[PDB]
RNA sequence: CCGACUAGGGAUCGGGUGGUGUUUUUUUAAU
């Protein structure tokens, strides 16, 4: 598997079966920007990277707002005017959640990819 | 010494103890600080305790 | 600067004079040397701006000789200066009082005695010869280094023409003694 | 699969109590390596005996860059080295007794083995291309 | 029962396998021993791994064993 | 319980201390 | 103490120069 | 923010955002004195606060390890408790101005009530799955633990009498303590 | 003596003389003392203005340099009581230089661990987790170490002992 | 009832660490 998608999966089915942290290893500067983004949003609460000197480790403190993150596997390039037409098919709803994208600026999500208008490739979701 | 007791005259203030002492560093001396304030505060509501 | 202006002009307190001045005295035990330093600086300028000044001067006097008897000894020569910027500036009974001071101060206190020889009324001064010539016969290596400043500051020069061959016939201490006896042979 | 290896601390320094020379310990090396040993063999002697924890931390690199670099290096890599001769020695069983119809499977698994990192090492080219197990 | 991730106890963490620790690291160590024969101090690990002999008197100071190695019976050892 | 009825000392610590890792300002 | 007569470079070397010499 | 009331009828108008106090970094937790204009508010650090001046009056953080909840005493009204997410529970006082003592616990202390008939005890309510009496003027010991809840307690209150507990947890239920027992004397 | 060939500050004076007085208190020593030159002597303030002399090494020697470093320090400390002496060497790349930079300026007490915590605000705290190596002298020096690493990287990073402060 | 899945509980097999009692036992090896 990734190296995004299980410590994605670590920290989805860890807060379905109702937990209060998750550690998830090994720890990237992808997946440090994606809990960022989300912590932004206000899914998850503060996280803290252990520094052992094989690769790093997170522990997540998440409360309840969270219900499915993932990663879109294929990193398709994405346009500033396709961004809603991308979010129109795969998020839930029309202003639920929020599309991830690795941009030029960087880990983004969708709007404010699209408010500093800047497209990129996609990485993954968040509602 | 400054205190080696020289003949009878001793009509002056000079040297003795209450001088400066080095300086702890700040955390220590905030340590210090808050835990005189925890003192005066404990006894602050040990007045409610009756 | 701001301190000394505080010690000017506020109409002092019920004590605050004797109790800073307490404080200025016991101050230059503060054991860095760049903390007394600026305590000595507080004793020259308090120095240059009396009739109580003559009790201070005796404490500045005893402390500066506890100063000059230091640890460091970089500011041992400033201690020196102090010494002579107050003995210089002093009145009569004080600097009478200083002399029976100087005439007071074992080999600890023989060192002090000719600091007090290189400090400091003719009759005193030749009093004060009297006691290096007592101490040039009496001729460790403190008392050595006393002799050599005494030497410096010159019967008892016969005294000292006898003992500088002796003492020629602690390398820092035998330059000294051939600066001595360079000078007693010009 | 089990979790059995070693756990290397957290720290990058020589204990503190590791009074030695920095350049003793790689004259020491040199030495046990001209009298035979294979990498592994000198770590762990070097560990038990004069108590350096490990090299790399010790002295500037690793011991396998040591030797190399002080003219001792291997014909051909340790692992592939025990592997071959693993092979060997059951290649030898099997023609003496032909009826060990386990250890012929056990061959089939050493020669995949060999054949993996052999592939490995040949597109780094630690070993030239055309080599083959004979 | 319940434990804090990271702000671990030292009474679970020491307890816990060496791998399964929050920042791992070896509970291995080395001590120094004296040769009964010369009294010289040679410094051993403890899972010692091989028959490690005093190299100024040749005496046989530990014993390889399955994980620890125990040392030969007049030894005096001090952990460091 | 099994481990206290083998081992030599351990102490009895209380519920109502067995969730402090530490106080500053120690108490005497 | 353990074994080695061979998988060195030198050590090769020196056994293809003994099957030299004979 | 300002409301408009119907509780008396004495009079007969401009309600909402008086004012607003402006920090550089996030807050997240705040609790009022109950005199003299004052508030607290904990966040990346904790800020000391009063409605007059736009800007903090004191920061009085013990170190630089962030600040997670807040409550001021009610009686005594000048002892302020928090909860920071180094599992610190540290008090201050503002006769002092100054932090007082802090302790740190086995997991996070989520909230804090401070008893509003005894002054000095207070009741935290943490991650493991208790609440946690702790006396003020020694805190080397809990005074009780009230254990019956199974995840982690989110919120706990004293009842205005001082005599009884509720406490509110993350599995979904609330649970109601007499304050001298320690177990659950209701669950809803 | 000590000082490259441009003008040596007064500082490097002051502590090339307590070099030279380590050198006339000799030949308990042989010989360890000779090659340790210095590059610059850097004053770092703090908080409190209680200044660091940061000692500068060119790191070929700071390994002998720091083999002895716990004894010369405690001379210096008697040379110039009340003032922090650390010791420092000179350097892709820049995190392992920072990395290298914080062991060598904290003492040989063995950093066990670098934590970084993420808010919720968007801000971050580094820290850093010194063990147990006479800790009494540690935690004074804990915001020294703070400042003098602020001061060569501008990474502000906070230090802390597991222990209760 | 399946998996990408959380914790456990008792018993058992192989290895390891620690404890400190009984069977063991001694200056022949270790066990
Ligand atoms: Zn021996």
């Given at each position: 598997s990734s190296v995004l998608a299980d410590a994605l999966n670590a920290i989805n089915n860890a807060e379905k079966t109702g937990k209060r942290q998750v550690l998830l290893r090994p720890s990237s500067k992808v997946i440090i920007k994606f809990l960022q983004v989300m912590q932004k949003h206000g899914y998850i609460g503060e996280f803290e990277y252990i520094d052992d000197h094989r690769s790093g480790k997170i522990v997540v403190q998440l409360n309840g707002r969270l219900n499915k993150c993932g990663v879109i596997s294929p990193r398709f390039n994405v346009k500033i005017g396709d961004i809603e037409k991308w979010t129109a098919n795969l998020l839930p709803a029309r202003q639920f959640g929020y599309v991830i994208l690795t941009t030029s600026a960087g880990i983004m999500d969708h709007e404010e990819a699209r408010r500093k208008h800047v497209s990129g490739k996609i990485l993954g979701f968040v509602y | 010494i400054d205190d080696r007791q020289v003949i009878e005259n001793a009509n002056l203030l000079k040297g003795k103890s209450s001088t400066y002492e080095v300086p702890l560093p700040q955390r220590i001396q905030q340590r210090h600080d808050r835990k005189a304030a925890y003192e005066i505060s404990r006894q602050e509501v040990s007045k409610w305790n009756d | 600067s701001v301190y000394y202006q505080f010690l000017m002009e506020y109409d002092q307190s019920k004590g605050r004079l004797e109790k800073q001045f307490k404080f200025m005295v016991d101050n230059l035990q503060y054991p860095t040397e760049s903390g007394r330093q600026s305590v000595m600086e507080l004793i020259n300028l308090i120095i240059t701006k009396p009739a109580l000044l003559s009790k201070l001067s005796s404490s500045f006097f005893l402390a500066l000789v506890n100063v000059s008897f230091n640890d460091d000894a970089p500011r041992c020569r400033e201690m020196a200066s102090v010494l002579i910027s107050t003995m210089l500036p002093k009145l009569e009974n004080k600097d009478l009082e200083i002399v029976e001071k100087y005439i007071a101060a074992d080999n600890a206190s023989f060192l002090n005695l000719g600091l007090r020889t290189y400090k400091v009324s003719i009759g005193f001064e030749h009093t004060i010869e009297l006691d290096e010539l007592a101490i040039k016969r009496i001729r460790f290596s403190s008392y050595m280094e006393a002799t050599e400043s005494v030497y410096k500051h010159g019967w008892d020069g016969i005294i000292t023409c006898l003992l500088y061959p002796h003492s020629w016939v602690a390398n820092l201490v035998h330059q000294l003694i051939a600066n001595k006896d360079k000078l007693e042979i010009s | 699969?089990?979790?059995?290896?070693?756990?290397?601390?957290?720290?990058?320094?020589?204990?503190?109590?590791?009074?030695?020379?920095?350049?003793?310990?790689?004259?020491?090396?040199?030495?046990?390596?001209?009298?035979?040993?294979?990498?592994?063999?000198?770590?762990?002697?070097?560990?038990?005996?004069?108590?350096?924890?490990?090299?790399?931390?010790?002295?500037?690199?690793?011991?396998?860059?040591?030797?190399?670099?002080?003219?001792?290096?291997?014909?051909?890599?340790?692992?592939?080295?025990?592997?071959?001769?693993?092979?060997?020695?059951?290649?030898?069983?099997?023609?003496?007794?032909?009826?060990?119809?386990?250890?012929?499977?056990?061959?089939?698994?050493?020669?995949?083995?060999?054949?993996?990192?052999?592939?490995?090492?040949?597109?780094?080219?630690?070993?030239?291309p055309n080599w083959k197990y004979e | 029962l319940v434990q804090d991730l990271l702000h671990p106890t030292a009474a679970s963490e020491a307890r816990k396998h060496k791998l399964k620790t929050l920042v791992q690291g070896p509970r291995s160590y080395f001590l120094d021993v004296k040769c009964p024969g010369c009294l010289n101090i040679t410094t051993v690990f403890s899972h010692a791994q091989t028959a490690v002999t005093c190299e100024s008197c040749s005496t046989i100071l530990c014993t390889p064993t399955g994980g620890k190695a125990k040392l030969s019976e007049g030894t005096s050892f001090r952990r460091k | 319980a099994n481990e206290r009825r083998t081992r030599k000392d351990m102490p009895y610590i209380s519920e109502r201390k067995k969730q402090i890792v530490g106080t500053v300002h120690k108490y005497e | 103490k353990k074994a080695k007569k061979d998988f060195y470079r030198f050590q090769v070397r020196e056994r293809k120069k003994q099957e030299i010499n004979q | 923010w300002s409301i408009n009331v119907d509780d008396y009828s004495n009079k007969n108008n401009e309600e909402g955002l008086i004012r607003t106090f402006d920090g550089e970094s996030a807050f997240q937790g705040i609790d009022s004195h109950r005199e003299n204009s004052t508030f607290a508010t904990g966040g990346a650090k904790i800020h000391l606060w009063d409605v007059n001046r736009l800007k903090p009056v004191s920061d009085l953080s013990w170190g630089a390890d962030n600040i997670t909840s807040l409550k001021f005493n009610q009686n005594e009204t000048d002892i302020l408790a928090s909860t920071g997410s180094d599992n610190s529970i540290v008090l201050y006082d503002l006769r002092t101005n100054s932090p007082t003592q802090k302790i740190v616990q086995t997991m996070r202390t989520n909230a804090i009530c401070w008893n509003p008939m005894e002054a000095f005890n207070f009741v935290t309510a943490n991650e493991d799955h208790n609440a946690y009496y702790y006396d003020m003027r020694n805190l080397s010991r809990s005074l009780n633990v009230f254990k019956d809840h199974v995840s982690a307690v989110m919120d706990v209150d004293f009842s205005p009498t001082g005599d009884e507990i509720v406490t509110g947890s993350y599995d979904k239920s609330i649970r109601i303590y007499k304050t001298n027992h320690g177990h659950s004397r209701e669950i809803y | 003596a000590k000082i490259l060939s441009q003008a040596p500050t007064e500082l490097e004076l002051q502590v090339a003389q307590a070099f030279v007085e380590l050198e006339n208190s000799s030949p308990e020593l042989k010989a360890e003392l000779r090659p340790l030159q210095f590059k610059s002597i850097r004053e770092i303030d703090v908080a409190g203005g209680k200044k660091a002399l940061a000692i500068f090494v060119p790191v070929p020697s700071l390994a002998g340099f720091h083999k002895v470093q716990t004894k010369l320090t405690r001379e210096l400390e008697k040379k110039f009581q009340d003032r922090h002496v650390i010791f420092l060497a000179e350097r892709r790349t820049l995190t392992a230089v920072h990395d290298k930079i914080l062991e060598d300026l904290v003492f040989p007490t063995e950093i066990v661990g670098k934590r970084v915590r993420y808010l919720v605000g968007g801000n971050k705290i580094q820290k850093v987790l010194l063990d147990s190596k006479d800790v009494q002298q540690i935690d004074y020096k804990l915001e020294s170490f703070q400042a003098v690493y602020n001061k060569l990287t501008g990474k502000q990073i906070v230090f802390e002992i597991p222990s209760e402060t």
């Open positions: - | - | - | 699969k089990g979790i059995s290896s070693s756990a290397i601390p957290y720290s990058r320094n020589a204990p503190a109590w590791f009074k030695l020379s920095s350049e003793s310990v790689i004259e020491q090396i040199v030495k046990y390596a001209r009298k035979g040993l294979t990498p592994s063999q000198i770590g762990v002697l070097l560990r038990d005996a004069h108590g350096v924890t490990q090299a790399r931390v010790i002295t500037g690199n690793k011991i396998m860059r040591i030797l190399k670099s002080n003219g001792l290096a291997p014909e051909i890599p340790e692992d592939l080295y025990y592997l071959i001769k693993k092979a060997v020695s059951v290649r030898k069983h099997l023609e003496r007794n032909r009826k060990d119809k386990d250890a012929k499977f056990r061959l089939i698994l050493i020669e995949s083995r060999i054949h993996r990192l052999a592939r490995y090492y040949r597109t780094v080219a630690v070993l030239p | - | - | - | - | -």
